[PDB]
Amino acid sequence: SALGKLQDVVNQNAQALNTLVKQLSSNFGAISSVLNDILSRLDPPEAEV
Amino acid sequence: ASVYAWNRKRISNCVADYSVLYNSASFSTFKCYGVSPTKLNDLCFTNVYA
């Protein structure tokens, strides 16, 4: 842990990217977190919402 | 069946042809919730309950 500053910087960056990827998999108050299933499980007008 | 004794059948391990239901049109109400009502309900389902 002598180079702890650089390790902290890369860990913060990795945590930010991992958080972004995890947020990508989010319901966000919809029916599902995947959009292809929304397209296949709804007609285009309802799906737009 | 009567309303209180609602009868449940499990549709398992068979392919389904949902399009006869859609094109029959004799069905008075064909309202679909959560699944598409534009004849796009032809998807892989683990369990189908009638």
UniProtKB/Swiss-Prot annotation, chain A:
<comment type="function">
    <text>Subunit of the fusion protein that is processed upon entry into the host cell. Mediates fusion of the virion and cellular membranes by functioning as a class I viral fusion protein. Contains a viral fusion peptide that is unmasked after S2 cleavage. This cleavage can occur at the cell membrane by host TMPRSS2 or during endocytosis by host CSTL. In either case, this triggers an extensive and irreversible conformational change that leads to fusion of the viral envelope with the cellular cytoplasmic membrane, releasing viral genomic RNA into the host cell cytoplasm.</text>
</comment>
<feature type="coiled-coil region">
    <location>
        <begin position="7"/>
        <end position="49"/>
    </location>
</feature>
<protein>
    <recommendedName>
        <fullName>Spike protein S2'</fullName>
    </recommendedName>
</protein>
